[PDB]
Amino acid sequence: MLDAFSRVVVNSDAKAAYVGGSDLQALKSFIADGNKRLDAVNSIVSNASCMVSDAVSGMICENPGLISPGGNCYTNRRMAACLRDGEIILRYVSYALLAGDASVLEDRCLNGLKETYIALGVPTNSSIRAVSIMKAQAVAFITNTATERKMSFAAGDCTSLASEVASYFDRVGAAIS
Amino acid sequence: MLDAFSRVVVNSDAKAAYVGGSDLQALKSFIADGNKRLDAVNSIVSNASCMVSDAVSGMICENPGLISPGGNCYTNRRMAACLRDGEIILRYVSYALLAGDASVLEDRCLNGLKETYIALGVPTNSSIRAVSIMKAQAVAFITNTATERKMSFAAGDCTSLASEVASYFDRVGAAIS
Amino acid sequence: MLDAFSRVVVNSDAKAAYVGGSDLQALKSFIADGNKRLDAVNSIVSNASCMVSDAVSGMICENPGLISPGGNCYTNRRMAACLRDGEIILRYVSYALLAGDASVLEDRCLNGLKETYIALGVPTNSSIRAVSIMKAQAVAFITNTATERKMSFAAGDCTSLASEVASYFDRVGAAIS
Amino acid sequence: AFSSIQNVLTDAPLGTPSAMGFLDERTEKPLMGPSEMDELVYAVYKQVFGNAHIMESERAELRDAESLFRYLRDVREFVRALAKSNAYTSRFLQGNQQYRFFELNFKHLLGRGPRSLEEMASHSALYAEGGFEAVIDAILDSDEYAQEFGSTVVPYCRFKGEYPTNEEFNRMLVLKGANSTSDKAGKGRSKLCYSIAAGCSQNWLSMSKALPFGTEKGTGFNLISSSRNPAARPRIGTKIPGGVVFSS
Amino acid sequence: MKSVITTVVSAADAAGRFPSNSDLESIQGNIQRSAARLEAAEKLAGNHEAVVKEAGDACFAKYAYLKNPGEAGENQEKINKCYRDVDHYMRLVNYCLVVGGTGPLDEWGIAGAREVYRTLNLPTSAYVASIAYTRDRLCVPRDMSAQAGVEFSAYLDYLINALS
Amino acid sequence: MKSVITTVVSAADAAGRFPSNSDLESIQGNIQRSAARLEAAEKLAGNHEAVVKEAGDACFAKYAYLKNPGEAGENQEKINKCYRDVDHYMRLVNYCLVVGGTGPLDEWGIAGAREVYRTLNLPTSAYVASIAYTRDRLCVPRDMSAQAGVEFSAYLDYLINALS
Amino acid sequence: MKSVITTVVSAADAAGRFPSNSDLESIQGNIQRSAARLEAAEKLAGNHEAVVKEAGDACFAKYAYLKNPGEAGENQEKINKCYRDVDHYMRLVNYCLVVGGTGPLDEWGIAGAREVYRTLNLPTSAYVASIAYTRDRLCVPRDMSAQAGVEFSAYLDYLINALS
Amino acid sequence: FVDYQIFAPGTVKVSPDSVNANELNPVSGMSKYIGKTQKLVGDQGISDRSDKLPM
Ligand SMILES: C=CC1=C(C)[C@@H](Cc2[nH]c(/C=C3N=C(/C=C4\NC(=O)[C@H](C)[C@H]4CC)C(C)=C\3CCC(=O)O)c(CCC(=O)O)c2C)NC1=O
Ligand SMILES: C=CC1=C(C)[C@@H](Cc2[nH]c(/C=C3N=C(/C=C4\NC(=O)[C@H](C)[C@H]4CC)C(C)=C\3CCC(=O)O)c(CCC(=O)O)c2C)NC1=O
Ligand SMILES: C=CC1=C(C)[C@@H](Cc2[nH]c(/C=C3N=C(/C=C4\NC(=O)[C@H](C)[C@H]4CC)C(C)=C\3CCC(=O)O)c(CCC(=O)O)c2C)NC1=O
Ligand SMILES: C=CC1=C(C)[C@@H](Cc2[nH]c(/C=C3N=C(/C=C4\NC(=O)[C@H](C)[C@H]4CC)C(C)=C\3CCC(=O)O)c(CCC(=O)O)c2C)NC1=O
Ligand SMILES: C=CC1=C(C)[C@@H](Cc2[nH]c(/C=C3N=C(/C=C4\NC(=O)[C@H](C)[C@H]4CC)C(C)=C\3CCC(=O)O)c(CCC(=O)O)c2C)NC1=O
Ligand SMILES: C=CC1=C(C)[C@@H](Cc2[nH]c(/C=C3N=C(/C=C4\NC(=O)[C@H](C)[C@H]4CC)C(C)=C\3CCC(=O)O)c(CCC(=O)O)c2C)NC1=O
Ligand SMILES: C=CC1=C(C)[C@@H](Cc2[nH]c(/C=C3N=C(/C=C4\NC(=O)[C@H](C)[C@H]4CC)C(C)=C\3CCC(=O)O)c(CCC(=O)O)c2C)NC1=O
Ligand SMILES: C=CC1=C(C)[C@@H](Cc2[nH]c(/C=C3N=C(/C=C4\NC(=O)[C@H](C)[C@H]4CC)C(C)=C\3CCC(=O)O)c(CCC(=O)O)c2C)NC1=O
Ligand SMILES: C=CC1=C(C)[C@@H](Cc2[nH]c(/C=C3N=C(/C=C4\NC(=O)[C@H](C)[C@H]4CC)C(C)=C\3CCC(=O)O)c(CCC(=O)O)c2C)NC1=O
Ligand SMILES: C=CC1=C(C)[C@@H](Cc2[nH]c(/C=C3N=C(/C=C4\NC(=O)[C@H](C)[C@H]4CC)C(C)=C\3CCC(=O)O)c(CCC(=O)O)c2C)NC1=O
Ligand SMILES: C=CC1=C(C)[C@@H](Cc2[nH]c(/C=C3N=C(/C=C4\NC(=O)[C@H](C)[C@H]4CC)C(C)=C\3CCC(=O)O)c(CCC(=O)O)c2C)NC1=O
Ligand SMILES: C=CC1=C(C)[C@@H](Cc2[nH]c(/C=C3N=C(/C=C4\NC(=O)[C@H](C)[C@H]4CC)C(C)=C\3CCC(=O)O)c(CCC(=O)O)c2C)NC1=O
Ligand SMILES: C=CC1=C(C)[C@@H](Cc2[nH]c(/C=C3N=C(/C=C4\NC(=O)[C@H](C)[C@H]4CC)C(C)=C\3CCC(=O)O)c(CCC(=O)O)c2C)NC1=O
Ligand SMILES: C=CC1=C(C)[C@@H](Cc2[nH]c(/C=C3N=C(/C=C4\NC(=O)[C@H](C)[C@H]4CC)C(C)=C\3CCC(=O)O)c(CCC(=O)O)c2C)NC1=O
C-alpha cells in the first residue's frame, strides 16, 4: 500500500540506482503544494455525507425505474447498501488524494468489485453515473466554485489537484465497467 | 430451560412417579386459562419501547446524579448501554411469563449478573429502581388500568397473571442485590 | 491510554470545565521545548539493543547464583526469555516518554505483572536490579554524560526529561517490588 | 448489539484488506507485501499462542504454514494449521487437564468463554471420536466462527453487548487477562472448571483486571459478599395508596 | 481517544516496535498546527456562554413545534436539558482542539447518540440546526485567525456529518 | 510500505473512518523534516564511492581473520561480493530518507537476513563494524547540515539494532 | 454549651465560690468580640442556601467516585442526605458564632461522629472537602470584614481538625 | 394542548435556566432544574393564596 514518495523508489530499485538529484525535484513539487493538498482533502471530508446522499438520490432521479419492484435500490435493505457502498468509494478516493497515489484505491477497494456486482446483479450503468456525480461534485469543493458552501481558502491555483482527483474517479469507472 | 409443563415432570422424576390425575389438575387449568396468558404478553410487547424509556428516564428523575460528571449514565456511551440493558431484562421476563416458569430468566439473564455490575461499576440500587418502575408498568397493561393506552380485551380477571409477572420482576432485584 | 494533552482534558471533564487560559501555559510550555522530547527519545531507542544486553549481564555479576542450576536464567531458553522480557519493559517506557504520561505503561505492561512473576518463579528482587541498571544508563544518554557514544545534540539541558524517565523506571521498579 | 466498549475503548480488529479478492480472477487478494504481511502474522502469533514468547528455533517449525499463508491468503486456514502444530499441543495439551485444553480453545479460536456444561461435554464427545483434531476443526468449521470472523480477520476477543448468557461475558474476562499475561501461569488447572460444572460465577477482581482503560475497573463492590444466595427469599414490597403490596 | 500521539504508538504496539523515525515526524506536525488550534480553543473558552446562548435558540426559532404536548422541549426542564446538551457538545469541540484529534468527541459525545436520541424522540435535525447555525456564524478575520477558523470549523462539521 | 502517510491511512481504514484532523496534522510534520532528510539523501547519492570505499577496507582493519582460508573472504572474488552487500545497504539507507519511514530497510534489507547470514556462515558482527564506521567518520559542520546529520545517523543506527 | 459564660461559671462552681473579679473580666471580652462574630453569623444566616449548595458539589467535584455502585452518592436520597448533612454543619457554625464558643459543634456535630461515619461507611475526607472549600472561598473584604472573617474561619478549621 | 406550530415563526419563545453543564446538574444529584430534586429549594414551601378570596 504505497504513497507518492514510495512510487519513485519502486521505479528506482529496478535500475538499482540511488535516487539522486535529478528525480528529487518531482517530490519537492509535492511539498510545495503540500498545504494546498491538505487544504483540498479537508474540503471533501467535511462535505462527505452530503456528497453521497446527493449522488445516490440523483441516480434515483435520473433513473426512476431503480425503485420499481425488482429494482436494485428497491427496498430499505437494498437502499441502505448502496448508500453504504458510496461511502466506501468516497472514502477510498480521499485516501488516494492524501497519499497522491492510486495504490490505496486499486488494491483495497477495486480488487474483485467487478465480479461481485455481476454476482449480485448490481447494475454498472447506474453506478458509473453515481460515481460520476460525486466526481463533478468533488471539483466544486476543491476549486471553491460550488453553489452553496463557499469554504474559506487561500488565493491561488488548485486546478491541478482538482484534475488529479478526477483521475481517481476514472480509475473507479474503468474497473467496475 | 423449562416451562410450566416441564417443571411438573422434573418434580415427579425425583419420586419416579407418573403424572396422573391428581397432578394434572394444575396443568389442566394452565391450558384452560391459556388464552389469557397469550392475551397478556402482547399487552406487554406492544408497549415495550415506551416501557423501557419511561423506566430509565424515570430513574434519572429521582436521581439526577446519574447524569452529572461521575454518574454511570453520564455520556451517550453509558446511557445507550443502560437503555439496552433494561430492554434485555424486559425481554427475558416476557419469555418467563409466556412459559410460566422463571427458569430461562434465572440462568441466562440473572446468573452472574451481580459480578458484571460490581466489575463495571454499575449502581445496583438505582438499577433495581428501573426494574421496579417497569414492574408497575407491566401490571397496569395486564389489568388494563393504564391512564393512556386502553387496549381491547375480554372481560374477567387477569389478577393471577399480574402477580405472576410481579414475582418475575422481583427475582431481578434479588439477584443483583 | 492518555497522552499529556488528554490528561488535562480528563481532569477538566471531572469539573465539567472548559480548558481555559490557565492550563494552556502548561501545554504551550510542553510544545515549546517539545523538540527535546523527540531529541531524547531518539537517544534511547538508538542504543536500545545494547541497553538491554548490558542490563541483564550486570544482573548476573551481582547475583551469580542465577546461572546456577535452580536459578531462573539457568538454561538457554530462559536466558533468551529475559533478554526479550526486558525488551518489553524498555519498549513501554519509551512509549510513555513519547506520550508524557504513564497511562500506556501501567495499563499495557504493569497490570498483573507481579501476579504472574510469582506464578512462574521469577525472583522479583533480582529483576528490580535488572530494571535499575538500564534506568541509570538511559538517564546518562539523555544527559549526554556517557563514556562511549557521544551523540551530538544541541546545547541546553534535558534535566527535567532525565527525571521524567527516571520516574517511569521507578513505576515498573515499584510495581514488581 | 450496541456494545459501549468495543470500537470505542479498544482498538479495531486486524485482518486482511477485503473478502472480494477471492472473486478477483487475476489475483487471489489485495497483495499486502512483506511489511504489511508480517505485522498481521505478529497478531496471529499473539492470539493463538497467548503471549507464549516463541523462540527463533521454535518458529522454524512453523516455516511451512506461513509460506502457504502468503500465497493462499485465508486467515482461517492459517489458524487451523497452527492449532495442529507441535507448538500448540506442547503448550496447551501436554501438561494440562482436559477442561484446561478446552477452555483455551474457546479463548484462542473464538474470543469467548464456554457457556455451559452441555456445550463443554460435547467437546469431550468429539475427543472420543477423532482426538484433538476433531475438536479443533469443529470450532473452525462452525457457524459461530463463520459469522464473526470468517477468512478475513484474526479471531479477537469481541465485546458484543448482546451475549446469549450473561455468564459468557464473565468467563471471557477471566480467560483473557492483561497484556502482561500469558496462559501458562497455572500448573494445568482450568480456571473456569468449578464454575462450569456447578453453575456459579467468577470473582470480580479477576474480571476487572482484564477490562480496558476507562471502564470503572473494580468499583461497585459492596464490602459484604460478592455472589448471590440462591436460598434467600426476600420481601420486596410496592407502595400502592392504601398500604404496601407484597406481590410474591 | 484518537489523537496524533495515541495512534502512532497504538500502531507501534500492534507490530511490537519501538518509536520509529516515522513517528517522530508526526509529532513535528503537532508543533506546527498547535498554534492555530490552541488559539481557536482559547477563544472558545472565554466566549462559551455567548456562543451556546445563540446556538440554542436557533433550534427553537426554527422548530416551534417542540413545545407541543409530547414533543422534545415540552416543559422548562426539557428546555434546560436542551441548552445543556449543546453546552456539552461545544465543550467537546473545545476538548478536541486541545488534544488535537477527534478523540474526545467520538467517545464522549457521538458514540451512542444514534441509539440514545432515537429512543427518547429527540430529533437529529434540531441538533444539527443548532450546530450548523454556529458553523457559518464564524467570521474569518473578526472572531479568530484565518487558519484558526479552519480548525474550529473542522470539528463542527465533523459533528454535523456524524449526527446526520 | 512503512512511511508516515501509510500509517495514518491504514489506521483510518481499519476503523472505517474518513481522514480526520489528526491525520492531516501528521502530514504537516513530513513537510518540516523534508528539508533535512532529503538533503542528506541527495548527499549520499554522490558521495557513496568515497564512503563505501572507506568502510570495507576499514572493516578488515578490526577483522583481520576474514582474509584467512576457511572464513568468508578468503579470495579476491568474495571481497568484490563484499562490496556488493554494502552498496546494497547504502542504496537502501538512501531510500528510507526519501520515503521517510523504515519501509525499504525492513522489508527488503532486513527481512530474511537473519536466516541467510546464519546458514551461509557470514558473520553479522563485521557488518556492525562497517556500518558504524560510517557513523563516527560522519561529522556535521563541514559535510552536511545539522538536522541532516541527525537523520542520517538515526537511520544507520536502525539496522545496527536490527542486525545485532 | 462550651462558651465564655459557661466556662467561668463551671470553674467557679467546682471551686464553690461567687463570681469573682476575673469572672466578670471574661464577659467583657465577650462584649468587645461580639461585634465581629455577629456580623459573620448574620452574613451566613442570610445567604446559607447558596453557601451550602456551593460547597455540596465541591465534594463531588473532587471525589467523582462517590457515584459508583455501593458508594454514598448513588441515588437521589443519598445526595439529599448529603446536602442535608452539610447544611447541618453550617447551621452549627452559625450557632457557634452566636454563642461564642465551640459548644454546639462539640455536642451536636463532633461527638459520636467517628463511629457513625465508619459504621455507615461515609468517607470522612468528603465531609471535610466541603468544609475546606468554604474556608478558602471567603474573600476577607468582600463578604465580611477582617475580624469577622477571622472568627468565621477559626470555627471552620476547628471542624476540620475534629474530623481529622 | 397548544399546538405551537400554528403560530408565526419567531413568536414561540423558549429560554433555558443556565447554559452550563455544571449548574443544571452537578457531580452529585443535587440539581435545581433536572429531575426529581427540584423540590429541594430552601424557599418555595409556602405560597401566596391569601390574595384571592375565602372561596
Ligand atoms: C433527481 C434529483 C436530483 C438531485 C438530488 C440532484 C443530483 C445532482 N446534484 C448535482 C449538483 C451538485 N451537488 C452539489 C453538492 C452539494 N450541494 C450543496 O448545496 C451541498 C453543499 C452539497 C451536498 C448536498 C453541488 C454544489 C452541485 C452543483 C454543481 C457543483 O457545483 O458541483 C448534479 C450535477 C452533476 C453534474 O451534472 O455535473 C446532479 C445530477 N440533481 C437532480 O436532478
Ligand atoms: C471495499 C469496497 C466495498 C464495496 C463497494 C461494497 C461492495 C458490496 N456491495 C454489496 C451489496 C450491495 N451493493 C448494492 C449497491 C448498489 N446497487 C445499486 O443499485 C447502486 C448502483 C449501488 C449503490 C450505489 C446493493 C443494492 C447491495 C445489496 C445486494 C443484496 O441485497 O443482495 C456486497 C455484498 C454484501 C451485502 O450484500 O451486504 C458487497 C461486498 N463492499 C465493500 O467492502
Ligand atoms: C492539519 C490541517 C492542515 C490544513 C487544512 C492545511 C491548512 C493550510 N492551507 C494553507 C495554504 C493554502 N491553501 C491554498 C488553497 C487554495 N487557495 C485557493 O485559491 C484555492 C481555492 C484553494 C485550493 C484548494 C493555497 C493557494 C495556499 C497557500 C500556499 C500553500 O502553502 O499551500 C496553509 C498555509 C498558509 C498559512 O499558513 O496561512 C495552511 C496551514 N494545512 C494543515 O496543516
Ligand atoms: C422523573 C421523571 C418521571 C417519569 C418519566 C415518570 C416515570 C414513571 N412512570 C410510571 C408509571 C407508568 N409508566 C407507564 C408507561 C406508559 N404509559 C403509557 O400509557 C405509555 C404507553 C407508556 C410510555 C409512556 C405506565 C403504563 C405506568 C403505570 C400506570 C400509571 O401511570 O397509572 C411511574 C410509577 C411507577 C411507580 O409507581 O413506582 C413512574 C415513577 N415519573 C417521573 O417522575
Ligand atoms: C443477557 C444478559 C445481559 C445483560 C443484563 C446485559 C449486562 C451488561 N451490561 C453491560 C454494560 C453497561 N450496563 C450499564 C447499565 C446501567 N448503568 C446504570 O447506571 C444503570 C443503572 C444501568 C442501566 C439500566 C452501563 C452504563 C454499561 C457500560 C459501562 C461502561 O461504559 O463502562 C455489559 C458489558 C458489555 C458491554 O457493554 O460491552 C453487560 C454484559 N448484557 C447482557 O448480555
Ligand atoms: C395467537 C394470539 C392469541 C391472543 C392475543 C389471545 C387473544 C384472546 N384472548 C382471549 C380471551 C380472554 N382474554 C381475557 C383477558 C382480559 N379481559 C379483561 O378484561 C382483562 C383486562 C384481560 C386480562 C389480561 C379474558 C378474561 C378472556 C376470556 C376467558 C378465556 O376464554 O380464556 C381469547 C378467547 C375469546 C375469543 O376467542 O374471542 C382470545 C382468542 N389468544 C390467542 O390465541
Ligand atoms: C558483572 C558484570 C558487569 C557488566 C556487564 C557491566 C554492566 C554494567 N554497565 C554499567 C554501565 C553503563 N552501561 C552503559 C550503556 C552503554 N555503554 C556504552 O558504551 C554503549 C553505548 C551502551 C550499551 C552497551 C553506560 C553508558 C554506562 C555507564 C553509566 C552511565 O553513564 O549511565 C553498569 C552500572 C549500572 C548501575 O550503576 O546501576 C553495570 C552494572 N558492569 C559489570 O560489573
Ligand atoms: C507487556 C509486558 C509483558 C512482559 C514483561 C512479559 C511478562 C512475562 N515473562 C514471562 C517469562 C519469563 N520472564 C523471565 C524473566 C526473568 N527471569 C529472571 O531470572 C530475571 C530476573 C528476569 C529477566 C531476565 C524468564 C526467565 C521467563 C521464562 C520462564 C519460563 O520459561 O517458564 C511470561 C510467560 C510467557 C510464557 O512463556 O508463556 C510472561 C507473560 N510478557 C508481557 O506480555
Ligand atoms: C524527527 C525527529 C526529531 C528530532 C531528533 C529532533 C531534532 C531536534 N532537536 C532540536 C533541538 C534541541 N535539542 C536539544 C537537546 C540537547 N542539547 C543538549 O546539549 C542536551 C545534551 C540535549 C538534551 C536532551 C536542545 C537544548 C535543543 C534546542 C532548544 C529547543 O528548541 O528545545 C531541534 C531544533 C533545532 C535547534 O534548536 O537547533 C531539532 C529539529 N526534532 C525532531 O523533530
Ligand atoms: C508444505 C508445502 C510447501 C512447499 C513445497 C513450499 C513451496 C512454496 N514456496 C513458496 C514461495 C517461494 N519459494 C521461493 C523459492 C524459490 N524461488 C526461486 O527463485 C528459487 C529458484 C527457489 C528457491 C529454491 C521464493 C523466492 C518464494 C517467495 C515468492 C515471493 O516472494 O512471493 C510458496 C508460497 C508461500 C509464500 O508465499 O511464501 C510455497 C507453497 N512451501 C510450502 O509451504
Ligand atoms: C458529555 C456529553 C453529553 C451530551 C451531549 C448529552 C446528551 C444527552 N442529552 C440528553 C437529554 C435531553 N436532550 C434534550 C435535548 C433537546 N431537546 C430539544 O428540543 C432539542 C432537540 C435538544 C436541544 C438541542 C431533551 C429534552 C432531553 C431530555 C430527554 C427526555 O425528554 O426524556 C440525554 C438523556 C439523559 C438526560 O436526561 O440527561 C443525553 C445522554 N449528555 C451528555 O452527557
Ligand atoms: C554522505 C556521507 C559522508 C561521510 C560519512 C563523510 C565521510 C568522508 N570523509 C572524507 C574525508 C575527510 N573528512 C574530514 C572531516 C573531518 N575529519 C575529522 O576528524 C573531523 C571530525 C571532520 C570535520 C567535520 C577530513 C579532515 C577529511 C580528509 C582526511 C580524511 O581522509 O579523512 C571523505 C572524502 C571526500 C570528502 O572529503 O567528502 C568522505 C566521503 N563525508 C561524506 O560525504
Ligand atoms: C446536627 C448534626 C448532624 C449531622 C452533621 C448529621 C450527621 C449525619 N449524617 C448522616 C448521613 C449521611 N451523610 C452522607 C454524606 C455524604 N455522602 C457522600 O457521598 C459524601 C461522603 C457526603 C456528602 C458530604 C450520606 C449519604 C448520609 C446518609 C447515609 C445513608 O444514606 O446511609 C447521618 C445518618 C442519619 C441519616 O440517615 O441522616 C448522620 C447522623 N446528622 C445530624 O443530625
Ligand atoms: C456567608 C458566607 C459567604 C462566603 C464565604 C463568601 C463566599 C462566596 N463568594 C462568592 C463569589 C465570588 N467570590 C469571588 C472572590 C473574590 N472576589 C474579589 O473581588 C476578590 C478579589 C476575591 C476574594 C478571594 C469572586 C470573583 C466571586 C464571583 C464568582 C463566583 O461566582 O465565585 C459567592 C457566590 C455569590 C456571589 O458573590 O455572587 C459566595 C457564596 N460569600 C458569602 O456570603
PDB file of N, CA, C and O in Angstrom, chain C residues 46-67:
ATOM      1  N   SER C  46      17.979   4.440  19.829  1.00  0.00           N
ATOM      2  CA  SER C  46      19.156   4.157  19.018  1.00  0.00           C
ATOM      3  C   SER C  46      20.104   3.206  19.730  1.00  0.00           C
ATOM      4  O   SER C  46      20.759   2.390  19.081  1.00  0.00           O
ATOM      5  N   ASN C  47      20.187   3.292  21.054  1.00  0.00           N
ATOM      6  CA  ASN C  47      21.070   2.432  21.829  1.00  0.00           C
ATOM      7  C   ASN C  47      20.322   1.331  22.570  1.00  0.00           C
ATOM      8  O   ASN C  47      20.886   0.712  23.470  1.00  0.00           O
ATOM      9  N   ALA C  48      19.079   1.049  22.189  1.00  0.00           N
ATOM     10  CA  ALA C  48      18.236   0.163  22.981  1.00  0.00           C
ATOM     11  C   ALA C  48      18.566  -1.311  22.806  1.00  0.00           C
ATOM     12  O   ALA C  48      18.102  -2.128  23.604  1.00  0.00           O
ATOM     13  N   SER C  49      19.331  -1.679  21.787  1.00  0.00           N
ATOM     14  CA  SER C  49      19.766  -3.066  21.694  1.00  0.00           C
ATOM     15  C   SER C  49      20.903  -3.345  22.666  1.00  0.00           C
ATOM     16  O   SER C  49      20.905  -4.374  23.346  1.00  0.00           O
ATOM     17  N   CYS C  50      21.863  -2.424  22.751  1.00  0.00           N
ATOM     18  CA  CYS C  50      22.961  -2.539  23.698  1.00  0.00           C
ATOM     19  C   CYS C  50      22.513  -2.321  25.130  1.00  0.00           C
ATOM     20  O   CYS C  50      23.150  -2.844  26.051  1.00  0.00           O
ATOM     21  N   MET C  51      21.419  -1.589  25.341  1.00  0.00           N
ATOM     22  CA  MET C  51      20.988  -1.237  26.686  1.00  0.00           C
ATOM     23  C   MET C  51      20.369  -2.419  27.414  1.00  0.00           C
ATOM     24  O   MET C  51      20.563  -2.569  28.621  1.00  0.00           O
ATOM     25  N   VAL C  52      19.632  -3.269  26.704  1.00  0.00           N
ATOM     26  CA  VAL C  52      19.058  -4.443  27.352  1.00  0.00           C
ATOM     27  C   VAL C  52      20.110  -5.535  27.525  1.00  0.00           C
ATOM     28  O   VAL C  52      19.976  -6.386  28.409  1.00  0.00           O
ATOM     29  N   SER C  53      21.196  -5.498  26.747  1.00  0.00           N
ATOM     30  CA  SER C  53      22.230  -6.507  26.893  1.00  0.00           C
ATOM     31  C   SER C  53      23.108  -6.206  28.090  1.00  0.00           C
ATOM     32  O   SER C  53      23.455  -7.114  28.846  1.00  0.00           O
ATOM     33  N   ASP C  54      23.439  -4.936  28.310  1.00  0.00           N
ATOM     34  CA  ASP C  54      24.253  -4.568  29.455  1.00  0.00           C
ATOM     35  C   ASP C  54      23.460  -4.542  30.750  1.00  0.00           C
ATOM     36  O   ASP C  54      24.059  -4.510  31.826  1.00  0.00           O
ATOM     37  N   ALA C  55      22.130  -4.538  30.659  1.00  0.00           N
ATOM     38  CA  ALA C  55      21.286  -4.576  31.843  1.00  0.00           C
ATOM     39  C   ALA C  55      21.343  -5.939  32.507  1.00  0.00           C
ATOM     40  O   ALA C  55      21.728  -6.056  33.674  1.00  0.00           O
ATOM     41  N   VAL C  56      20.976  -6.992  31.773  1.00  0.00           N
ATOM     42  CA  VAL C  56      20.905  -8.318  32.376  1.00  0.00           C
ATOM     43  C   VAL C  56      22.263  -8.976  32.528  1.00  0.00           C
ATOM     44  O   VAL C  56      22.377  -9.940  33.284  1.00  0.00           O
ATOM     45  N   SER C  57      23.299  -8.481  31.860  1.00  0.00           N
ATOM     46  CA  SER C  57      24.625  -9.030  32.076  1.00  0.00           C
ATOM     47  C   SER C  57      25.257  -8.483  33.342  1.00  0.00           C
ATOM     48  O   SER C  57      26.119  -9.145  33.927  1.00  0.00           O
ATOM     49  N   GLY C  58      24.852  -7.289  33.764  1.00  0.00           N
ATOM     50  CA  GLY C  58      25.174  -6.804  35.085  1.00  0.00           C
ATOM     51  C   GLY C  58      24.265  -7.326  36.165  1.00  0.00           C
ATOM     52  O   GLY C  58      24.567  -7.173  37.349  1.00  0.00           O
ATOM     53  N   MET C  59      23.145  -7.931  35.781  1.00  0.00           N
ATOM     54  CA  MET C  59      22.319  -8.646  36.745  1.00  0.00           C
ATOM     55  C   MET C  59      22.972  -9.961  37.146  1.00  0.00           C
ATOM     56  O   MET C  59      22.778 -10.433  38.269  1.00  0.00           O
ATOM     57  N   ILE C  60      23.771 -10.545  36.252  1.00  0.00           N
ATOM     58  CA  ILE C  60      24.488 -11.774  36.570  1.00  0.00           C
ATOM     59  C   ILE C  60      25.650 -11.483  37.512  1.00  0.00           C
ATOM     60  O   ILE C  60      25.871 -12.210  38.484  1.00  0.00           O
ATOM     61  N   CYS C  61      26.361 -10.376  37.292  1.00  0.00           N
ATOM     62  CA  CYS C  61      27.607 -10.105  38.002  1.00  0.00           C
ATOM     63  C   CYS C  61      27.411  -9.649  39.443  1.00  0.00           C
ATOM     64  O   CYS C  61      28.399  -9.499  40.166  1.00  0.00           O
ATOM     65  N   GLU C  62      26.176  -9.416  39.879  1.00  0.00           N
ATOM     66  CA  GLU C  62      25.883  -9.117  41.268  1.00  0.00           C
ATOM     67  C   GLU C  62      24.996 -10.150  41.934  1.00  0.00           C
ATOM     68  O   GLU C  62      24.916 -10.160  43.165  1.00  0.00           O
ATOM     69  N   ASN C  63      24.324 -11.004  41.171  1.00  0.00           N
ATOM     70  CA  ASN C  63      23.676 -12.202  41.701  1.00  0.00           C
ATOM     71  C   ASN C  63      24.148 -13.383  40.870  1.00  0.00           C
ATOM     72  O   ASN C  63      23.453 -13.816  39.945  1.00  0.00           O
ATOM     73  N   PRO C  64      25.322 -13.947  41.178  1.00  0.00           N
ATOM     74  CA  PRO C  64      25.883 -15.004  40.326  1.00  0.00           C
ATOM     75  C   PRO C  64      25.248 -16.369  40.495  1.00  0.00           C
ATOM     76  O   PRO C  64      25.612 -17.290  39.758  1.00  0.00           O
ATOM     77  N   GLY C  65      24.307 -16.533  41.416  1.00  0.00           N
ATOM     78  CA  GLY C  65      23.536 -17.746  41.548  1.00  0.00           C
ATOM     79  C   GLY C  65      22.307 -17.810  40.676  1.00  0.00           C
ATOM     80  O   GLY C  65      21.441 -18.655  40.914  1.00  0.00           O
ATOM     81  N   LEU C  66      22.183 -16.922  39.695  1.00  0.00           N
ATOM     82  CA  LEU C  66      21.110 -17.017  38.722  1.00  0.00           C
ATOM     83  C   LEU C  66      21.413 -18.058  37.665  1.00  0.00           C
ATOM     84  O   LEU C  66      20.493 -18.700  37.149  1.00  0.00           O
ATOM     85  N   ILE C  67      22.695 -18.221  37.321  1.00  0.00           N
ATOM     86  CA  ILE C  67      23.104 -19.205  36.333  1.00  0.00           C
ATOM     87  C   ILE C  67      23.455 -20.540  36.964  1.00  0.00           C
ATOM     88  O   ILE C  67      23.895 -21.454  36.256  1.00  0.00           O
TER      89      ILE C  67
END
